[PDB]
Amino acid sequence: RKCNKLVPLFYKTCPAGKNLCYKMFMVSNLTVPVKRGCIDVCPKNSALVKYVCCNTDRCN
Amino acid sequence: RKCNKLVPLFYKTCPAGKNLCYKMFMVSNLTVPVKRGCIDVCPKNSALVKYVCCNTDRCN
Amino acid sequence: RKCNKLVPLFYKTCPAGKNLCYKMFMVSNLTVPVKRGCIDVCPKNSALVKYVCCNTDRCN
Amino acid sequence: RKCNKLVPLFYKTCPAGKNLCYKMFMVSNLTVPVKRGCIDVCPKNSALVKYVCCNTDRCN
Protein backbone atom coordinates (compact mmCIF):
# COMPACT_ATOMS: atom_id res chain seq x y z
CA ARG A 1 0.00 0.00 0.00
CA LYS A 2 1.25 3.45 -0.91
CA CYS A 3 -0.23 6.63 0.57
CA ASN A 4 -0.01 10.34 0.14
CA LYS A 5 1.73 12.46 2.77
CA LEU A 6 0.53 15.72 4.32
CA VAL A 7 1.64 17.34 1.08
CA PRO A 8 -0.21 14.86 -1.10
CA LEU A 9 1.85 15.10 -4.29
CA PHE A 10 4.35 12.94 -2.43
CA TYR A 11 3.65 9.45 -1.12
CA LYS A 12 5.35 6.69 0.77
CA THR A 13 5.14 2.91 0.86
CA CYS A 14 3.26 1.85 4.07
CA PRO A 15 4.80 -0.34 6.78
CA ALA A 16 3.52 -3.89 7.06
CA GLY A 17 0.14 -4.15 8.90
CA LYS A 18 -1.02 -0.70 7.74
CA ASN A 19 -3.07 -1.10 4.59
CA LEU A 20 -5.40 1.90 4.83
CA CYS A 21 -4.57 5.53 3.97
CA TYR A 22 -6.10 8.36 5.90
CA LYS A 23 -6.62 12.08 6.04
CA MET A 24 -7.16 13.76 9.45
CA PHE A 25 -8.97 17.08 10.05
CA MET A 26 -9.63 19.37 12.94
CA VAL A 27 -13.46 19.46 12.79
CA SER A 28 -13.29 23.30 12.86
CA ASN A 29 -11.28 23.31 9.56
CA LEU A 30 -12.34 20.91 6.80
CA THR A 31 -10.44 22.90 4.17
CA VAL A 32 -6.97 21.57 5.03
CA PRO A 33 -6.04 18.25 6.65
CA VAL A 34 -3.61 18.40 9.62
CA LYS A 35 -2.23 14.93 8.80
CA ARG A 36 -2.12 12.20 6.11
CA GLY A 37 -0.44 8.75 6.13
CA CYS A 38 -0.86 4.99 6.68
CA ILE A 39 -2.97 3.20 9.28
CA ASP A 40 -4.34 -0.24 10.32
CA VAL A 41 -8.01 0.58 11.08
CA CYS A 42 -9.84 3.90 10.84
CA PRO A 43 -10.02 5.72 14.21
CA LYS A 44 -13.41 6.76 15.49
CA ASN A 45 -14.54 10.35 14.90
CA SER A 46 -13.86 12.50 17.99
CA ALA A 47 -15.73 15.73 18.73
CA LEU A 48 -12.59 17.67 17.74
CA VAL A 49 -11.16 15.34 15.07
CA LYS A 50 -12.37 13.76 11.82
CA TYR A 51 -10.79 10.85 9.94
CA VAL A 52 -11.24 9.89 6.27
CA CYS A 53 -9.98 6.41 5.31
CA CYS A 54 -9.80 4.35 2.14
CA ASN A 55 -8.06 1.23 0.95
CA THR A 56 -6.31 1.82 -2.37
CA ASP A 57 -2.98 3.32 -3.28
CA ARG A 58 -2.86 7.13 -2.96
CA CYS A 59 -6.53 7.54 -2.10
CA ASN A 60 -6.01 10.04 0.75
CA ARG B 1 12.12 7.59 -23.78
CA LYS B 2 14.42 8.69 -20.95
CA CYS B 3 13.40 11.41 -18.51
CA ASN B 4 14.97 13.26 -15.66
CA LYS B 5 13.94 12.56 -12.15
CA LEU B 6 13.20 15.29 -9.63
CA VAL B 7 16.92 15.72 -9.08
CA PRO B 8 17.92 15.96 -12.72
CA LEU B 9 21.43 14.58 -12.36
CA PHE B 10 19.45 11.36 -12.31
CA TYR B 11 17.15 9.84 -14.91
CA LYS B 12 15.02 6.78 -15.80
CA THR B 13 13.71 4.84 -18.70
CA CYS B 14 10.01 5.55 -19.24
CA PRO B 15 7.56 2.69 -19.19
CA ALA B 16 5.64 1.55 -22.31
CA GLY B 17 3.17 4.18 -23.50
CA LYS B 18 4.73 7.10 -21.63
CA ASN B 19 6.76 9.03 -24.09
CA LEU B 20 6.62 12.62 -22.82
CA CYS B 21 8.77 14.02 -20.00
CA TYR B 22 7.35 16.59 -17.57
CA LYS B 23 8.14 19.01 -14.86
CA MET B 24 5.25 19.73 -12.50
CA PHE B 25 4.83 23.11 -10.82
CA MET B 26 2.58 24.64 -8.24
CA VAL B 27 0.20 26.97 -9.92
CA SER B 28 1.58 29.91 -8.14
CA ASN B 29 5.22 29.28 -9.05
CA LEU B 30 6.63 28.13 -12.33
CA THR B 31 10.39 28.13 -11.39
CA VAL B 32 10.47 25.45 -8.65
CA PRO B 33 9.63 22.02 -9.99
CA VAL B 34 7.77 19.86 -7.57
CA LYS B 35 7.90 16.55 -9.55
CA ARG B 36 9.53 15.21 -12.65
CA GLY B 37 9.00 12.04 -14.70
CA CYS B 38 7.32 10.30 -17.60
CA ILE B 39 3.79 10.69 -18.89
CA ASP B 40 1.57 9.61 -21.84
CA VAL B 41 -0.13 12.93 -22.57
CA CYS B 42 0.23 16.34 -20.94
CA PRO B 43 -2.58 17.31 -18.48
CA LYS B 44 -4.37 20.68 -19.29
CA ASN B 45 -7.01 21.44 -16.54
CA SER B 46 -6.76 24.31 -14.08
CA ALA B 47 -5.63 22.67 -10.90
CA LEU B 48 -3.35 23.26 -7.89
CA VAL B 49 -0.55 22.08 -10.18
CA LYS B 50 0.59 22.63 -13.74
CA TYR B 51 2.54 20.26 -16.06
CA VAL B 52 5.02 21.26 -18.73
CA CYS B 53 5.83 18.38 -21.08
CA CYS B 54 8.31 17.71 -23.82
CA ASN B 55 9.14 14.84 -26.18
CA THR B 56 12.97 14.41 -26.37
CA ASP B 57 15.32 12.51 -24.06
CA ARG B 58 15.90 14.05 -20.63
CA CYS B 59 14.19 17.19 -21.87
CA ASN B 60 12.57 17.92 -18.50
CA ARG C 1 14.68 24.68 14.00
CA LYS C 2 12.89 24.77 10.66
CA CYS C 3 14.48 23.61 7.42
CA ASN C 4 13.59 23.27 3.77
CA LYS C 5 12.88 20.01 2.14
CA LEU C 6 14.40 19.01 -1.17
CA VAL C 7 11.56 20.93 -2.88
CA PRO C 8 12.13 24.10 -0.92
CA LEU C 9 8.54 25.38 -1.15
CA PHE C 10 8.07 22.79 1.66
CA TYR C 11 9.74 22.55 5.03
CA LYS C 12 9.82 20.72 8.38
CA THR C 13 10.46 21.20 12.08
CA CYS C 14 13.79 19.55 12.83
CA PRO C 15 13.75 16.66 15.34
CA ALA C 16 15.35 17.72 18.65
CA GLY C 17 19.10 17.53 18.47
CA LYS C 18 19.32 18.68 14.90
CA ASN C 19 19.78 22.41 14.71
CA LEU C 20 21.44 22.90 11.35
CA CYS C 21 19.79 22.93 7.92
CA TYR C 22 21.74 21.53 4.98
CA LYS C 23 21.91 21.14 1.25
CA MET C 24 23.78 18.06 -0.03
CA PHE C 25 25.53 18.25 -3.40
CA MET C 26 27.52 15.76 -5.49
CA VAL C 27 31.16 16.59 -5.37
CA SER C 28 32.21 19.29 -7.86
CA ASN C 29 28.56 19.96 -8.87
CA LEU C 30 27.86 22.51 -6.19
CA THR C 31 24.77 23.86 -8.14
CA VAL C 32 22.12 21.00 -8.03
CA PRO C 33 21.13 19.99 -4.54
CA VAL C 34 20.57 16.29 -4.20
CA LYS C 35 19.15 16.34 -0.67
CA ARG C 36 17.94 18.96 1.81
CA GLY C 37 17.10 18.67 5.43
CA CYS C 38 18.07 18.90 9.11
CA ILE C 39 21.25 17.75 10.77
CA ASP C 40 23.17 17.91 14.09
CA VAL C 41 26.79 18.50 12.86
CA CYS C 42 28.00 19.29 9.35
CA PRO C 43 30.01 16.33 7.95
CA LYS C 44 33.52 17.34 6.60
CA ASN C 45 35.31 14.17 5.24
CA SER C 46 36.19 13.95 1.51
CA ALA C 47 33.41 11.98 -0.03
CA LEU C 48 31.24 11.53 -3.16
CA VAL C 49 28.95 14.17 -1.61
CA LYS C 50 29.42 17.53 0.01
CA TYR C 51 27.19 19.09 2.73
CA VAL C 52 26.71 22.88 3.09
CA CYS C 53 25.01 23.78 6.38
CA CYS C 54 23.59 26.89 8.00
CA ASN C 55 21.88 27.52 11.34
CA THR C 56 18.77 29.64 10.79
CA ASP C 57 15.28 28.76 9.83
CA ARG C 58 14.90 27.76 6.19
CA CYS C 59 18.41 28.86 5.33
CA ASN C 60 18.93 25.85 3.00
CA ARG D 1 40.51 -9.37 1.07
CA LYS D 2 40.21 -6.10 -0.76
CA CYS D 3 37.92 -3.43 0.63
CA ASN D 4 36.53 -0.10 -0.48
CA LYS D 5 37.73 3.17 0.96
CA LEU D 6 35.62 6.03 2.21
CA VAL D 7 35.34 7.07 -1.41
CA PRO D 8 34.21 3.63 -2.45
CA LEU D 9 35.27 3.80 -6.05
CA PHE D 10 38.78 3.06 -4.73
CA TYR D 11 39.82 0.06 -2.78
CA LYS D 12 42.80 -1.38 -0.92
CA THR D 13 44.15 -4.81 0.06
CA CYS D 14 43.57 -5.59 3.70
CA PRO D 15 46.43 -6.31 6.15
CA ALA D 16 46.71 -9.89 7.35
CA GLY D 17 44.06 -10.97 9.89
CA LYS D 18 41.49 -8.46 8.57
CA ASN D 19 39.23 -10.35 6.28
CA LEU D 20 35.95 -8.42 6.70
CA CYS D 21 35.09 -5.16 5.08
CA TYR D 22 32.84 -2.60 6.78
CA LYS D 23 31.17 0.76 6.58
CA MET D 24 30.36 2.83 9.61
CA PHE D 25 27.63 5.38 10.08
CA MET D 26 26.75 7.93 12.70
CA VAL D 27 23.29 6.77 13.83
CA SER D 28 21.81 10.17 13.04
CA ASN D 29 22.88 9.89 9.34
CA LEU D 30 22.40 6.66 7.41
CA THR D 31 22.92 8.45 4.09
CA VAL D 32 26.67 8.74 4.04
CA PRO D 33 29.06 6.52 5.93
CA VAL D 34 31.81 8.31 7.90
CA LYS D 35 34.19 5.47 7.56
CA ARG D 36 35.10 2.49 5.37
CA GLY D 37 37.78 -0.19 5.55
CA CYS D 38 39.00 -3.58 6.68
CA ILE D 39 38.42 -5.22 9.98
CA ASP D 40 38.82 -8.53 11.82
CA VAL D 41 35.51 -8.80 13.74
CA CYS D 42 32.31 -6.79 13.23
CA PRO D 43 31.93 -4.56 16.29
CA LYS D 44 28.66 -4.13 18.11
CA ASN D 45 26.64 -1.05 17.18
CA SER D 46 26.49 1.66 19.86
CA ALA D 47 24.20 4.59 20.69
CA LEU D 48 26.51 6.64 18.45
CA VAL D 49 27.53 4.39 15.49
CA LYS D 50 26.28 1.63 13.20
CA TYR D 51 28.54 -0.84 11.44
CA VAL D 52 27.65 -2.87 8.39
CA CYS D 53 30.20 -5.69 7.72
CA CYS D 54 30.58 -8.19 4.96
CA ASN D 55 33.09 -10.91 4.06
CA THR D 56 33.81 -10.70 0.29
CA ASP D 57 35.94 -8.48 -1.86
CA ARG D 58 34.70 -4.86 -2.24
CA CYS D 59 31.41 -5.67 -0.50
CA ASN D 60 31.33 -2.40 1.59
GROMACS .gro file of N, CA and C in nm, chain D residues 1-4 12-23 36-44 51-60:
model
  105
  181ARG      N    1   4.166  -1.032   0.103
  181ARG     CA    2   4.051  -0.937   0.107
  181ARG      C    3   4.093  -0.800   0.058
  182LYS      N    4   4.013  -0.747  -0.033
  182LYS     CA    5   4.021  -0.610  -0.076
  182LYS      C    6   3.895  -0.540  -0.030
  183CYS      N    7   3.908  -0.417   0.017
  183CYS     CA    8   3.792  -0.343   0.063
  183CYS      C    9   3.792  -0.201   0.007
  184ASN      N   10   3.672  -0.146  -0.003
  184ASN     CA   11   3.653  -0.010  -0.048
  184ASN      C   12   3.687   0.088   0.059
  192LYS      N   13   4.148  -0.107  -0.146
  192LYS     CA   14   4.280  -0.138  -0.092
  192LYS      C   15   4.282  -0.285  -0.045
  193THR      N   16   4.400  -0.347  -0.043
  193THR     CA   17   4.415  -0.481   0.006
  193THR      C   18   4.427  -0.469   0.153
  194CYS      N   19   4.350  -0.549   0.225
  194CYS     CA   20   4.357  -0.559   0.370
  194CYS      C   21   4.490  -0.615   0.424
  195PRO      N   22   4.534  -0.563   0.541
  195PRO     CA   23   4.643  -0.631   0.615
  195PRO      C   24   4.601  -0.769   0.657
  196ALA      N   25   4.698  -0.853   0.690
  196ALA     CA   26   4.671  -0.989   0.735
  196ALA      C   27   4.585  -0.990   0.860
  197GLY      N   28   4.493  -1.086   0.871
  197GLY     CA   29   4.406  -1.097   0.989
  197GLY      C   30   4.282  -1.007   0.986
  198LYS      N   31   4.268  -0.926   0.880
  198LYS     CA   32   4.149  -0.846   0.857
  198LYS      C   33   4.084  -0.893   0.730
  199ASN      N   34   3.989  -0.982   0.744
  199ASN     CA   35   3.923  -1.035   0.628
  199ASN      C   36   3.777  -0.996   0.611
  200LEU      N   37   3.726  -0.902   0.692
  200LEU     CA   38   3.595  -0.842   0.670
  200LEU      C   39   3.615  -0.700   0.624
  201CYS      N   40   3.520  -0.652   0.547
  201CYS     CA   41   3.509  -0.516   0.508
  201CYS      C   42   3.389  -0.456   0.585
  202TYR      N   43   3.391  -0.325   0.606
  202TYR     CA   44   3.284  -0.260   0.678
  202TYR      C   45   3.262  -0.119   0.629
  203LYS      N   46   3.143  -0.070   0.658
  203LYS     CA   47   3.117   0.076   0.658
  203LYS      C   48   3.054   0.116   0.790
  216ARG      N   49   3.503   0.383   0.597
  216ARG     CA   50   3.510   0.249   0.537
  216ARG      C   51   3.647   0.182   0.546
  217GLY      N   52   3.651   0.051   0.560
  217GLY     CA   53   3.778  -0.019   0.555
  217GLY      C   54   3.769  -0.167   0.582
  218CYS      N   55   3.874  -0.216   0.647
  218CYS     CA   56   3.900  -0.358   0.668
  218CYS      C   57   3.889  -0.379   0.814
  219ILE      N   58   3.846  -0.496   0.857
  219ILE     CA   59   3.842  -0.522   0.998
  219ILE      C   60   3.846  -0.670   1.024
  220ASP      N   61   3.880  -0.709   1.147
  220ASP     CA   62   3.882  -0.853   1.182
  220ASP      C   63   3.746  -0.906   1.225
  221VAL      N   64   3.677  -0.834   1.312
  221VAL     CA   65   3.551  -0.880   1.374
  221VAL      C   66   3.453  -0.765   1.365
  222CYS      N   67   3.326  -0.790   1.335
  222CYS     CA   68   3.231  -0.679   1.323
  222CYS      C   69   3.198  -0.627   1.462
  223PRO      N   70   3.225  -0.500   1.492
  223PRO     CA   71   3.193  -0.456   1.629
  223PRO      C   72   3.043  -0.441   1.653
  224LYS      N   73   3.004  -0.438   1.777
  224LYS     CA   74   2.866  -0.413   1.811
  224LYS      C   75   2.835  -0.271   1.772
  231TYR      N   76   2.758  -0.018   1.236
  231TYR     CA   77   2.854  -0.084   1.144
  231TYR      C   78   2.773  -0.175   1.058
  232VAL      N   79   2.810  -0.183   0.930
  232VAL     CA   80   2.765  -0.287   0.839
  232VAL      C   81   2.894  -0.363   0.794
  233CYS      N   82   2.900  -0.494   0.814
  233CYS     CA   83   3.020  -0.569   0.772
  233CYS      C   84   2.985  -0.677   0.674
  234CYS      N   85   3.079  -0.712   0.590
  234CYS     CA   86   3.058  -0.819   0.496
  234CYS      C   87   3.192  -0.891   0.474
  235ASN      N   88   3.190  -1.006   0.410
  235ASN     CA   89   3.309  -1.091   0.406
  235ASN      C   90   3.353  -1.129   0.265
  236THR      N   91   3.327  -1.046   0.164
  236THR     CA   92   3.381  -1.070   0.029
  236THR      C   93   3.445  -0.944  -0.028
  237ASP      N   94   3.516  -0.959  -0.138
  237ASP     CA   95   3.594  -0.848  -0.186
  237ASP      C   96   3.504  -0.731  -0.226
  238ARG      N   97   3.539  -0.609  -0.185
  238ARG     CA   98   3.470  -0.486  -0.224
  238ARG      C   99   3.318  -0.489  -0.194
  239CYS      N  100   3.281  -0.555  -0.087
  239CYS     CA  101   3.141  -0.567  -0.050
  239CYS      C  102   3.087  -0.446   0.027
  240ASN      N  103   3.174  -0.361   0.083
  240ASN     CA  104   3.133  -0.240   0.159
  240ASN      C  105   3.119  -0.112   0.075
   0.00000   0.00000   0.00000
